[PDB]
Amino acid sequence: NELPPENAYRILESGPIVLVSTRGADGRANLMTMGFHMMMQHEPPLVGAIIGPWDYSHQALSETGECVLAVPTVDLAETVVDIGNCSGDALDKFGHFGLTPVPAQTVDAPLVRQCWANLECRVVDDGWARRYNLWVLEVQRIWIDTARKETRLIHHQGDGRFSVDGDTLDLGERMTKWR
Amino acid sequence: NELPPENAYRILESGPIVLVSTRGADGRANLMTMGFHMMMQHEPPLVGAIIGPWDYSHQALSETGECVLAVPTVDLAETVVDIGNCSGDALDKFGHFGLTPVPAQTVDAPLVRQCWANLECRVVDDGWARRYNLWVLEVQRIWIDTARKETRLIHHQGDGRFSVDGDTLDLGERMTKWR
Ligand SMILES: Cc1cc2nc3c(=O)[nH]c(=O)nc-3n(C[C@H](O)[C@H](O)[C@H](O)COP(=O)(O)O)c2cc1C
Numbered sequence: 573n574e575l576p577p578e579n580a581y582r583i584l585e586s587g588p589i590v591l592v593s594t595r596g597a598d599g600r601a602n603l604m605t606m607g608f609h610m611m612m613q614h615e616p617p618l619v620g621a622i623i624g625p626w627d628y629s630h631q632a633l634s635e636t637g638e639c640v641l642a643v644p645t646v647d648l649a650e651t652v653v654d655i656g657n658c659s660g661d662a663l664d665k666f667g668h669f670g671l672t673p674v675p676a677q678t679v680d681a682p683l684v685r686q687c688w689a690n691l692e693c694r695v696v697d698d699g700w701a702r703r704y705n706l707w708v709l710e711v712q713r714i715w716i717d718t719a720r721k722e723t724r725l726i727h728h729q730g731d732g733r734f735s736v737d738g739d740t741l742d743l744g745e746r747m748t749k750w751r
Numbered sequence: 752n753e754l755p756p757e758n759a760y761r762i763l764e765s766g767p768i769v770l771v772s773t774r775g776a777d778g779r780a781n782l783m784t785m786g787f788h789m790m791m792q793h794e795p796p797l798v799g800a801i802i803g804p805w806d807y808s809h810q811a812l813s814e815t816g817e818c819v820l821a822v823p824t825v826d827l828a829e830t831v832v833d834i835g836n837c838s839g840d841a842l843d844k845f846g847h848f849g850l851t852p853v854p855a856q857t858v859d860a861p862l863v864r865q866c867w868a869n870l871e872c873r874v875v876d877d878g879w880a881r882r883y884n885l886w887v888l889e890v891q892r893i894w895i896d897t898a899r900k901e902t903r904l905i906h907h908q909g910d911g912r913f914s915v916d917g918d919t920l921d922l923g924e925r926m927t928k929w930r
C-alpha cells in the first residue's frame with residue numbers, strides 16, 4: 573500500500589530507529605542503522621539525517637544522492653542492532669541477515685521487504701554534510717506493509733537499549749490550532 | 752540529580768516529545784511543544800531543533816540564544832498538547848497550566864519541575880535558522896528527577912496521536928563497535 577509522501581511525519585516524527593538502504597555506483601546494495609534523524613518539514617516532506625564517514629554507506633549517499641529509510645519493527649531488533657555494528661564494505665548484509673531487497677520506484681536503492689514502512693528519499697541539500705554530517709532528504713514515496721502482523725516500532729535510547737511502543741494515546745481532539 | 756551533558760543522547764535519541772522553555776528579554780518565561788528534533792552529535796552534545804516564526808518563542812530564541820528542553824512523561828500528555836495549541840504572546844503558560852519554573856544553572860530560561868528531564872541549552876549555530884527554521888543547540892547541563900515514579904515518555908506520531916513507551920529491550924551486549 574502507498575501513502576502520499578506528505579504523510580512522512582506520521583511515520584518518522586516519533587523517532588523510530590531506522591535502517592538506511594543504499595546502492596552504490598557499483599550496483600551493490602547495503603544497509604546501516606540510524607538513530608540521529610528528525611522531521612524538518614511536513615510539506616514538502618523533509619528529513620534530516622546524520623550519516624558520517626565512519627559508515628561505508630556514506631560513499632553511496634555522497635555519490636548517488638539516494639537512499640531508502642526502511643522502518644523496522646520490534647521483531648527485527650537484533651538484526652537492526654547487528655546491522656549497526658558491522659560494515660557493508662566487505663559483507664552482504666541483505667544476504668547475511670535474510671532481508672529481501674525490492675525495487676524502488678524513484679531511486680536505485682532497494683526497499684526492504686521485511687520493514688513495515690519504506691520511504692524513498694533523495695538528497696536535496698548537502699550544504700551541511702561536511703559541517704555536521706547532516707543530509708537533508710526529501711521523501712519521494714512511502715510504502716506500507718498493511719498486512720504485517722507485528723507493527724510495533726522501537727526507539728533507540730542509546731547503548732543498544734530500545735523502547736518498544738506500548739499504548740497509543742489519541743489527543744487529536746485537542747489539536748485545535750492544527751486542523 | 753545531574754548527568755554529564757554528553758549523556759544527552761540517552762534522553763533525546765529516542766525521539767520523545769519535548770517542551771521548549773524560554774525566557775524573553777522582557778523577563779517573561781514561556782513554553783512551547785516540539786516534535787521536530789534530533790540528536791546531531793554525541794560529544795560535544797549537539798541537538799537539532801525546528802522552531803519557526805509561527806511560535807512566539809522564536810523571538811526569545813533569536814534574542815537570547817538560550818532554552819531548556821524539558822522532557823515530559825505520559826501523565827503530562829494533555830498539558831503538552833495544550834501548550835502546543837496556544838501562544839505565550841498573550842498567556843503565562845507556566846501559571847495557566849500549573850507548571851513550576853525552577854532556576855537553571857547556565858541559562859535564564861527556567862527548568863520545569865514536573866518534567867522528568869531538563870537539558871539546559873545554548874544556540875550555537877543559527878546558520879540554517881532562516882533557511883529551515885533549524886537551530887543547532889549544545890547541551891550545557893542535564894537534570895533528572897530520579898525519584899519520579901512515572902517515567903514513560905511519549906512520542907508524537909502526528910495529529911495529536913502519541914505512542915507511550917512500553918518495555919525496554921537491552922541489546923547492549925551486541926554494541927561491539929560502540930563500547
Ligand atoms: C542503534 C544504532 C544507531 C545508530 N545511529 C547512527 C546514526 O544516526 N548515524 C550514523 O552515521 N551511524 C549510526 N549508527 C552506526 C552505523 O549504523 C554503523 O557505523 C554501521 O556499521 C555502518 O554500516 P556501513 O559501514 O555498512 O555503512 C548507529 C548504530 C546503531 C546500532
Ligand SMILES: Cc1cc2nc3c(=O)[nH]c(=O)nc-3n(C[C@H](O)[C@H](O)[C@H](O)COP(=O)(O)O)c2cc1C
Binds near residue numbers: 781784801
Ligand atoms: C505535538 C506537537 C508538536 C509540535 N512540534 C513543533 C515543532 O517541532 N516545531 C515548532 O516550531 N512547533 C511545533 N509545534 C507547534 C508549537 O508548539 C505551537 O505553535 C505553540 O503554540 C507555540 O507556542 P508559543 O507561541 O508560545 O511559542 C508542535 C505542537 C504540538 C502540539
Ligand code: NA
Binds near residue numbers: 680
Ligand atoms: Na538512476
Ligand code: NA
Binds near residue numbers: 586764766790
Ligand atoms: Na528525532
